[model samples]
Target: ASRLYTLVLVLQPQRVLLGMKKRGAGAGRWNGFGGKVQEGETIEDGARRELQEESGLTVDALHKVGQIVFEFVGEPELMDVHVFCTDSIQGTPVESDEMRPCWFQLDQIPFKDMWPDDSYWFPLLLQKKKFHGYFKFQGQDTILDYTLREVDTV
Candidate 1:
């Protein structure tokens, strides 16, 4: 059971940042700011570290938004995902050898270029609405199950 942490960074209007990994086995396209949780690391620490490593930005604040658990047919066991949101941050976004960071506007998100599941719930998150989503995918094409629920924050 591998755990992953991801941050949904909202940049300037009409701009969303994403990373591009080399095209190879089990590698194609994905979202921005994420990596495996290292040893002796808290989820928040992993999220902050991944954000810096991938986007070169050091976040000042990070809020856990939601989480997801899913399993691919032929991949490893179930995967646990911790999603986060950060409002204040520093440094300019840049690209690394493992990832190329780019911005996409609110209206110009390249759905076709990202995982299909993104289109289903990304809007909710961008609207400042915290949500937890669960989905099962087959080779990134077939969606087995999808569900979403708002996180009551009051």
Candidate 2:
């Protein structure tokens, strides 16, 4: 079954905002702030809520950057992570129980400590490119098979 989720990134010209997951699914890893979408919540609403709940920032607008599916080797669940981003956000990013907000230079993203699939299509995201991808993972750290590329729309 497909589980819907959102992953939001707030960016500026030189850098992007990232959150260190203090606990839960991606504990100890740096990633965009997001979570599963609840019933009756739209993906945009879910993304905004997650950013605020995890990092205390409010997204003024979220533009779609990409969408990707994640299938873990033995897990039956299919995860669809809808990627959203904005430069016109509001409020200051603050530490929350779920995450600690941090900024990283565009050229210095810490891919090694993040979900392995991030490194593949994330650059296209930063450049305002749209795409769709499917990643089959052996586990959290191992991407077994994948296909990704820039596209006109996802």
Candidate 3:
């Protein structure tokens, strides 16, 4: 079995938006804003909704930038995540039950506080290249191994 999700990021010329998860699956983890795709919603619709709900901003433009599949040891469900980015958006980020949003400079991203697999593909995001990836996690914090590749488009 598998679950579909979205991860929407706001990219500034010098920085990107991230959030410290306050509750749920990734609580205490720092990452972009998004979550599970809701019933009756398209993938883009889910991404748009999740971003606004987590950060209080409406995206002016959204681009599908990557796809990542995550399989955690002993977990039957695989996570199929669609990653999106937008440089055009409105409103300051607002804290919500699930996350606290913040901006990080391209060179100052807090990778240590993010998922182990992030470091592998984040650079691709920064460079505006699309990607496809697969990650196998031994546990919450240990990535046994992973593979990533750039593509012309997602």
Candidate 4:
């Protein structure tokens, strides 16, 4: 099976929970809550696990927002990202070894500190809009050479 990752966005009226983690050499920074899909876990289960692991949020209902594929040159890996959005959560945000969770105002996100593509689709999501985006990165550069599409309405 191909490598898969899940990104869960827990939204609130005031702030959005975003996490950061340091990974491979060029994997500088990223947002959202997610990780790899485990052997026996479903995609939704993996997403929930990742969210709880990275940030201390336990969500009861996560709306499957969308999915996107990321292909990079040198990594030789394909990342299938299952995106989820939840407005109802049960825990406070806390930091973990792999990630540090923080809240960002809806209009004041630190885009410079996150993956470039985040600024593109995140706004759509905040408006309860649905979209599918293709992000191709050469390295740590934020300049995108790809496209984004609003696939369906939610």
Identify the runs in model 3 with alpha carbons over 4 angstroms from their true place. none
For model 2, residues 76-139, the per-residue Cα lDDT tens digits are 9999999988998888889877688889999999999888888988888877889899999986
Clashing pairs in 2: none
Error of 2 at 59 (Å): 0.8
For candidate 4, lDDT tens digit of each residue in 1-154? 2478899998888789887785653244658888899999999999999888878888897888877778776677778888999988887888766677788888888888888778788888888877777788876664457677777752
Per-residue error for 48 in candidate 1, Å, reads 0.5
lDDT of all predictions: 0.73, 0.89, 0.91, 0.80
Sort by lDDT, best first: what order? 3, 2, 4, 1
Q: How close is candidate 1 to the true structure, as a TM-score?
A: 0.86
Residue-level lDDT of model 3, residues 1-154, one tens digit each, is: 8899999879889999899998778889889988899889999999999989889999976899999999999999999999999999988899877788889989999999998888999998988999999999988898888889999878
How many clashes in candidate 3?
0
Q: What's the lDDT for candidate 1?
A: 0.73
Candidate 3 Cα deviation (angstroms), residue 32: 0.5
Residue 135 displacement (Å), model 3:
0.3
Model 4 TM-score (2 dp): 0.88
- In model 4, which runs have C-alpha deviations exceeding 4 angstroms? 22-30
Which residues of candidate 1, in runs, are more than 4 Å off? 12-14, 23-26
Candidate 1: RMSD over Cα atoms? 2.3
TM-score of model 2 (CA atoms): 0.96
